[PDB]
Amino acid sequence: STSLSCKQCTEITTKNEIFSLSLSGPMAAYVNPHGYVHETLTVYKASNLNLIGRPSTEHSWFPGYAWTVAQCKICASHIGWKFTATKKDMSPQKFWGLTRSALLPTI
């Protein structure tokens, strides 16, 4: 299926990975604490990403999940976040939220 790639550059995910974590569809707008709006697409798996920092639950858009910033391994452009369950009774235990503007093609 169609690959989604780093816009700046590297395949990051494919459309086959896309799922709806919550009922707001697979991609919705979320607001960060400083007024940046991120159209965040939820995919089960992503490749070619490096993580920055430790996981945090602060202002998590997906309650029960911690986020870790994720960037392109090639150009270091911000791509999204890895989300990791804080409890065992959640499913999935991990996924990625990718910001729409960081990916090509444009969805």
Partner: peptide, 27 residues
């Protein structure tokens, strides 16, 4: 442990210089 923060995405750094490089990439 990482007190320099990017308010666009939540990225945090130990070195101010790495925050500066990070911010540049958002442009």
């Amino acid at each position: 442990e990482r007190p320099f923060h990017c308010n666009q995405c939540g990225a945090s750094f130990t070195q101010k210089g790495n925050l500066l490089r990070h911010i540049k990439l958002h442009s």
